[PDB]
Motif scaffolding. Structure first.
Motif, PDB file in Angstrom:
ATOM      1  N   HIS A 164       0.834  -1.231   0.000  1.00 48.17           N
ATOM      2  CA  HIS A 164       0.000   0.000   0.000  1.00 48.17           C
ATOM      3  C   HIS A 164       0.856   1.263   0.000  1.00 48.17           C
ATOM      4  CE1 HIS A 164      -4.143  -1.651   0.877  1.00 48.17           C
ATOM      5  NE2 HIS A 164      -3.352  -2.748   0.940  1.00 48.17           N
ATOM      6  N   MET A 165       1.862   1.399   0.875  1.00 51.79           N
ATOM      7  CA  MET A 165       2.588   2.686   1.004  1.00 51.79           C
ATOM      8  C   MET A 165       4.018   2.523   1.506  1.00 51.79           C
ATOM      9  SD  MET A 165       0.454   3.841   4.373  1.00 51.79           S
ATOM     10  CE  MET A 165       0.106   5.461   3.691  1.00 51.79           C
ATOM     11  N   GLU A 166       4.767   3.613   1.376  1.00 53.60           N
ATOM     12  CA  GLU A 166       6.168   3.807   1.819  1.00 53.60           C
ATOM     13  C   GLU A 166       6.176   4.895   2.898  1.00 53.60           C
ATOM     14  OE1 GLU A 166      10.212   5.573  -0.157  1.00 53.60           O
ATOM     15  OE2 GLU A 166       9.273   3.837  -1.210  1.00 53.60           O
ATOM     16  N   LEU A 167       6.840   4.637   4.024  1.00 53.73           N
ATOM     17  CA  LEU A 167       6.942   5.567   5.175  1.00 53.73           C
ATOM     18  C   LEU A 167       8.169   6.455   5.043  1.00 53.73           C
ATOM     19  CD1 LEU A 167       6.052   3.031   7.989  1.00 53.73           C
ATOM     20  CD2 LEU A 167       4.527   4.373   6.534  1.00 53.73           C
ATOM     21  N   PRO A 168       8.205   7.588   5.781  1.00 55.51           N
ATOM     22  CA  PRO A 168       9.318   8.540   5.740  1.00 55.51           C
ATOM     23  C   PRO A 168      10.716   7.911   5.848  1.00 55.51           C
ATOM     24  CG  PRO A 168       7.558   9.460   7.059  1.00 55.51           C
ATOM     25  CD  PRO A 168       7.149   8.045   6.698  1.00 55.51           C
ATOM     26  N   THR A 169      10.840   6.777   6.504  1.00 59.15           N
ATOM     27  CA  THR A 169      12.167   6.152   6.658  1.00 59.15           C
ATOM     28  C   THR A 169      12.540   5.373   5.387  1.00 59.15           C
ATOM     29  OG1 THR A 169      11.015   4.489   7.647  1.00 59.15           O
ATOM     30  CG2 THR A 169      11.924   6.132   9.204  1.00 59.15           C
ATOM     31  N   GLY A 170      11.661   5.243   4.392  1.00 53.61           N
ATOM     32  CA  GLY A 170      11.917   4.392   3.204  1.00 53.61           C
ATOM     33  C   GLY A 170      11.477   2.938   3.396  1.00 53.61           C
ATOM     34  N   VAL A 171      11.002   2.566   4.577  1.00 55.48           N
ATOM     35  CA  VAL A 171      10.403   1.219   4.798  1.00 55.48           C
ATOM     36  C   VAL A 171       8.947   1.227   4.313  1.00 55.48           C
ATOM     37  CG1 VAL A 171      12.016   0.767   6.672  1.00 55.48           C
ATOM     38  CG2 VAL A 171       9.755   1.739   7.177  1.00 55.48           C
ATOM     39  N   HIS A 172       8.354   0.060   4.132  1.00 52.69           N
ATOM     40  CA  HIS A 172       7.071  -0.088   3.403  1.00 52.69           C
ATOM     41  C   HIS A 172       6.009  -0.636   4.342  1.00 52.69           C
ATOM     42  CE1 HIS A 172      10.101   0.160   0.222  1.00 52.69           C
ATOM     43  NE2 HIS A 172       9.178   0.968  -0.284  1.00 52.69           N
ATOM     44  N   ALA A 173       4.753  -0.343   4.052  1.00 53.43           N
ATOM     45  CA  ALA A 173       3.622  -0.885   4.832  1.00 53.43           C
ATOM     46  C   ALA A 173       2.522  -1.388   3.892  1.00 53.43           C
ATOM     47  CB  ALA A 173       3.122   0.145   5.812  1.00 53.43           C
ATOM     48  N   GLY A 174       1.869  -2.454   4.339  1.00 54.87           N
ATOM     49  CA  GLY A 174       0.734  -3.031   3.629  1.00 54.87           C
ATOM     50  C   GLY A 174      -0.213  -3.716   4.566  1.00 54.87           C
ATOM     51  N   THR A 175      -1.204  -4.369   3.967  1.00 53.12           N
ATOM     52  CA  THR A 175      -2.322  -5.072   4.637  1.00 53.12           C
ATOM     53  C   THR A 175      -2.246  -6.571   4.376  1.00 53.12           C
ATOM     54  OG1 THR A 175      -3.797  -4.883   2.749  1.00 53.12           O
ATOM     55  CG2 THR A 175      -3.867  -3.097   4.359  1.00 53.12           C
ATOM     56  N   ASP A 176      -2.891  -7.315   5.274  1.00 53.36           N
ATOM     57  CA  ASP A 176      -3.382  -8.685   4.997  1.00 53.36           C
ATOM     58  C   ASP A 176      -4.331  -8.556   3.800  1.00 53.36           C
ATOM     59  OD1 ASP A 176      -5.918  -7.967   6.226  1.00 53.36           O
ATOM     60  OD2 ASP A 176      -5.568  -9.184   8.008  1.00 53.36           O
ATOM     61  N   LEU A 177      -4.824  -9.670   3.299  1.00 51.58           N
ATOM     62  CA  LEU A 177      -5.674  -9.713   2.082  1.00 51.58           C
ATOM     63  C   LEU A 177      -7.154  -9.578   2.471  1.00 51.58           C
ATOM     64  CD1 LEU A 177      -4.966  -9.853  -0.822  1.00 51.58           C
ATOM     65  CD2 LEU A 177      -3.014 -10.484   0.636  1.00 51.58           C
ATOM     66  N   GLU A 178      -7.438  -9.228   3.735  1.00 53.48           N
ATOM     67  CA  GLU A 178      -8.771  -8.759   4.190  1.00 53.48           C
ATOM     68  C   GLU A 178      -8.697  -7.247   4.396  1.00 53.48           C
ATOM     69  OE1 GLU A 178      -9.891 -11.814   7.276  1.00 53.48           O
ATOM     70  OE2 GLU A 178     -11.012 -12.652   5.573  1.00 53.48           O
ATOM     71  N   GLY A 179      -7.528  -6.646   4.134  1.00 52.09           N
ATOM     72  CA  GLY A 179      -7.330  -5.190   4.042  1.00 52.09           C
ATOM     73  C   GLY A 179      -6.959  -4.535   5.367  1.00 52.09           C
ATOM     74  N   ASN A 180      -6.599  -5.301   6.390  1.00 54.08           N
ATOM     75  CA  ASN A 180      -6.142  -4.693   7.660  1.00 54.08           C
ATOM     76  C   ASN A 180      -4.645  -4.464   7.569  1.00 54.08           C
ATOM     77  OD1 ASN A 180      -8.290  -7.052   8.757  1.00 54.08           O
ATOM     78  ND2 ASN A 180      -8.778  -4.902   9.128  1.00 54.08           N
ATOM     79  N   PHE A 181      -4.203  -3.258   7.919  1.00 54.26           N
ATOM     80  CA  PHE A 181      -2.769  -2.892   7.955  1.00 54.26           C
ATOM     81  C   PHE A 181      -2.060  -3.849   8.910  1.00 54.26           C
ATOM     82  CE2 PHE A 181      -3.441   0.792   5.343  1.00 54.26           C
ATOM     83  CZ  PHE A 181      -2.242   0.834   4.665  1.00 54.26           C
ATOM     84  N   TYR A 182      -0.805  -4.172   8.615  1.00 49.93           N
ATOM     85  CA  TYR A 182       0.135  -4.540   9.687  1.00 49.93           C
ATOM     86  C   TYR A 182       0.652  -3.239  10.286  1.00 49.93           C
ATOM     87  CZ  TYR A 182       0.041  -9.258   7.635  1.00 49.93           C
ATOM     88  OH  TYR A 182      -0.323 -10.477   7.133  1.00 49.93           O
ATOM     89  N   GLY A 183       0.440  -3.085  11.580  1.00 53.31           N
ATOM     90  CA  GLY A 183       0.990  -1.983  12.365  1.00 53.31           C
ATOM     91  C   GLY A 183      -0.009  -0.844  12.450  1.00 53.31           C
ATOM     92  N   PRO A 184       0.452   0.304  13.006  1.00 54.35           N
ATOM     93  CA  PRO A 184      -0.402   1.458  13.315  1.00 54.35           C
ATOM     94  C   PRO A 184      -0.539   2.432  12.136  1.00 54.35           C
ATOM     95  CG  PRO A 184       1.848   1.935  13.932  1.00 54.35           C
ATOM     96  CD  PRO A 184       1.867   0.538  13.356  1.00 54.35           C
ATOM     97  N   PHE A 185      -0.751   1.921  10.926  1.00 57.93           N
ATOM     98  CA  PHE A 185      -0.682   2.709   9.672  1.00 57.93           C
ATOM     99  C   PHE A 185      -2.095   2.878   9.078  1.00 57.93           C
ATOM    100  CE2 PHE A 185       3.425   0.275   9.979  1.00 57.93           C
ATOM    101  CZ  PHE A 185       4.191   1.333  10.403  1.00 57.93           C
ATOM    102  N   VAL A 186      -2.280   3.985   8.335  1.00 58.24           N
ATOM    103  CA  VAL A 186      -3.542   4.351   7.628  1.00 58.24           C
ATOM    104  C   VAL A 186      -3.197   4.704   6.171  1.00 58.24           C
ATOM    105  CG1 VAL A 186      -4.449   5.005   9.871  1.00 58.24           C
ATOM    106  CG2 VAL A 186      -3.572   6.811   8.400  1.00 58.24           C
ATOM    107  N   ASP A 187      -4.085   4.364   5.233  1.00 57.83           N
ATOM    108  CA  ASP A 187      -3.926   4.606   3.773  1.00 57.83           C
ATOM    109  C   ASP A 187      -4.254   6.087   3.491  1.00 57.83           C
ATOM    110  OD1 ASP A 187      -6.633   3.841   4.316  1.00 57.83           O
ATOM    111  OD2 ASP A 187      -6.795   2.413   2.616  1.00 57.83           O
ATOM    112  N   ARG A 188      -3.352   6.959   3.908  1.00 55.40           N
ATOM    113  CA  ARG A 188      -3.449   8.427   3.753  1.00 55.40           C
ATOM    114  C   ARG A 188      -2.030   8.990   3.636  1.00 55.40           C
ATOM    115  NH1 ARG A 188      -4.159  12.403   8.888  1.00 55.40           N
ATOM    116  NH2 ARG A 188      -4.226  14.304   7.605  1.00 55.40           N
ATOM    117  N   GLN A 189      -1.879  10.057   2.846  1.00 58.01           N
ATOM    118  CA  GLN A 189      -0.611  10.793   2.603  1.00 58.01           C
ATOM    119  C   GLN A 189      -0.381  11.766   3.750  1.00 58.01           C
ATOM    120  OE1 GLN A 189      -0.078  12.400  -1.294  1.00 58.01           O
ATOM    121  NE2 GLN A 189       1.688  13.633  -0.744  1.00 58.01           N
ATOM    122  N   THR A 190       0.174  11.266   4.837  1.00 62.02           N
ATOM    123  CA  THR A 190       0.605  12.059   6.007  1.00 62.02           C
ATOM    124  C   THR A 190       1.854  11.383   6.557  1.00 62.02           C
ATOM    125  OG1 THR A 190      -0.043  13.295   7.902  1.00 62.02           O
ATOM    126  CG2 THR A 190      -0.848  11.008   7.842  1.00 62.02           C
ATOM    127  N   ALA A 191       2.776  12.142   7.136  1.00 65.13           N
ATOM    128  CA  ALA A 191       3.993  11.582   7.764  1.00 65.13           C
ATOM    129  C   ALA A 191       3.545  10.680   8.921  1.00 65.13           C
ATOM    130  CB  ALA A 191       4.890  12.695   8.242  1.00 65.13           C
TER     131      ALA A 191
END
Ligand SMILES: *[C@](O)(C(=O)NC)[C@H](C[C@@H]1CCNC1=O)NC(=O)[C@H](CC1CC1)n1cccc(NC(=O)CCc2ccccc2)c1=O
Ligand SMILES: *[C@](O)(C(=O)NC)[C@H](C[C@@H]1CCNC1=O)NC(=O)[C@H](CC1CC1)n1cccc(NC(=O)CCc2ccccc2)c1=O
Ligand SMILES: [Cl-]
Ligand code: NA
Lengths: 302, 301
Positions: A164-191
């Motif tokens: 789904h996205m790339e964080l300020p540190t250059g590491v990446h975040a995504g979801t399980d295939l039911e669409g829940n993030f791993y970790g405290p992340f949201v699908d929005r363009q904010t630091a």
């Protein structure tokens, strides 16, 4: 012998990768039976990204706003459904290349393979760990979203990750295939903060076992340690604490090498406290923590 | 962004992998059109292995001795042709999954993906470089022989490597798909030397470039050097000397970053002359030489 970062063969998954376009945005989707899965932000304009209401934005869309292409053929989207941070597009055709498959939620410290795709075409495959902070150190450019991570168990593809996205540190975040993030992340363009990463101790021990199987023996001492002694040393170097459960997992490697899990823990102990004295291990100058005991067994025995 | 050892997707090559059995020996073959290619030491028993006469050994074999299997399906071997160190078994059926393909001989310095197989089943994919001393730092157990290495250009599969053996040092050796050995090696169970390896200088630069694109900046310096000045310090630290072709090949990464190839050559002189002091570039404390300039481009745009 030898030892590399190795990925599951990508074939069965190459067959499920399609292109999804919604106005300006095109990204990758996962076509299994008559459903295509992709990140919901496919609907967002770059305006919407700052602070999307995905509810309002999805109401603005109808099936014909979704262009799904399987190679050179388009698939008519009939249904669509928002499940947490993924979109499910119901399509008129079922993937005849659909493998036996599962959706699983991996744990921190576990690895999977990533089929990095662009415009619905597989580009590259690599191995990742889910960091203890629920990020991944992957390789993703714009157009890679909806790339998946997976494991194979002979016949069965386990789908565990969608990018789904790339964080300020250059590491990446995504979801399980039911669409829940791993970790405290949201699908929005904010630091967004990931938090302190820690070393996957159980994986590092596995790597040291792979080193000995391949004949790097210099870091072995005749010392042993208790789990508690190892752990209060380990905490100090920012290492995930080691449970009886981690020891039971390392067991089969204990046995292939004839070195007790706790003798190896004493070896790790000495490395953190003394630190490698400009020597290498599997021609590496640092300790590797992205090989599961399973990875090491898979490779150094099968 | 980020930067990983990436393998080509294996789907095309997975379609071509089969199991070959000669008597007691079983290993992996590549099935393209109506021909299966595999290493010839498939006809050996483990006493033969020590010093094989492949000619007299092959003479004793007939088509029926050669069991070939595509998943559950048996293919009728109807012809066998030894070519250098590979066996060509002709079969009654064309692989309907045969991709567009070529057979190429990669040069030292170049990378390819390896699809590790056992009993004609793909198990894993990894990226290797051909070392200047024509060895590869593979991951290969017993059964992996006939595992192939390749690149993909869009839809077309360049087959470059087939796995035969492990050397006394732990590294691996094989052939092109015409079964000529990369390097001075033979398919005998006998101790053989690869002799002095060298650092692939052009790859270290491309990797330094991958680092800058990713925001590892710290090793960049106000200085620029000449090829002659650079190569004098290269000879010393056992690096391959740098040529105009190497500068020409690094051009596009030069373009992407805005850092002249000889500015970057000056960051490297620096690093060899002072070590890293345990500092990390893309979280490696050593210099990586197994990423080509094409591999950095492919992955950084
Ligand atoms: C996918 O949507 C895609 O591949 N196709 C559109 C991308 C893939 C990203 C981009 C480059 N590398 C990747 O992994 N995902 C995004 O662009 C996300 C979408 C958001 C979930 C909604 N995305 C959008 C905007 C911004 C970012 N990240 C950044 O800009 C870097 C981190 C950062 C730093 C400071 C301030 C804000 C953000 C992003 O990942
Ligand atoms: C294939 O024949 C195979 O997969 N068949 C089932 C194997 C692949 C091996 C398995 C372990 N790692 C590999 O790469 N290749 C061999 O077994 C070769 C065949 C011979 C070329 C004809 N092979 C046979 C015997 C011995 C070795 N090497 C070693 O024993 C290690 C190096 C060594 C050390 C000291 C003295 C001599 C040799 C070998 O690779
Ligand atoms: Cl390192
Ligand atoms: Na390293």
């Amino acid at each position: 012998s030898g030892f590399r970062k190795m990925a599951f063969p990508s074939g069965k998954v190459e067959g499920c990768m399609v292109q999804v376009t919604c106005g300006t945005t095109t990204l990758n989707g996962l076509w299994l039976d008559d459903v295509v899965y992709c990140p919901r932000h496919v609907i967002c304009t770059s305006e919407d990204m700052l602070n999307p209401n995905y509810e309002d934005l999805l109401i603005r869309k109808s099936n014909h706003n979704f262009l799904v292409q399987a190679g050179n053929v388009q698939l008519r989207v009939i249904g669509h459904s928002m499940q947490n941070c993924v979109l499910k597009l119901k399509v008129d055709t079922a993937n005849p290349k659909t493998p036996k498959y599962k959706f699983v939620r991996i744990q921190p410290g576990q690895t999977f393979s990533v089929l990095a795709c662009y415009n619905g075409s597989p580009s590259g495959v690599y191995q990742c760990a889910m960091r203890p902070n629920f990020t991944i150190k992957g390789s993703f450019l714009n157009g890679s979203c909806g790339s998946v991570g997976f494991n194979i168990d002979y016949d069965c593809v386990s789908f565990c990750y969608m990018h789904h996205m790339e964080l300020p540190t250059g590491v990446h975040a995504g979801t399980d295939l039911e669409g829940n993030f791993y970790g405290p992340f949201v699908d929005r363009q904010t630091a967004q903060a990931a938090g302190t990463d820690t070393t996957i101790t159980v994986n590092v021990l596995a790597w040291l076992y792979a080193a000995v199987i391949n004949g790097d023996r210099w870091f072995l001492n005749r010392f042993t340690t208790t789990l508690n002694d190892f752990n209060l040393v380990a905490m100090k170097y920012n290492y995930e604490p080691l449970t009886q459960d981690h020891v039971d997992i390392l067991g089969p490697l204990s046995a292939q090498t004839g070195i007790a899990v706790l003798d190896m823990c004493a070896s790790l102990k000495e490395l953190l406290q003394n630190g490698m004295n400009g020597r290498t291990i599997l021609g590496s100058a640092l300790l590797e923590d992205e090989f599961t005991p399973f990875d090491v067994v898979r490779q150094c025995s099968g």
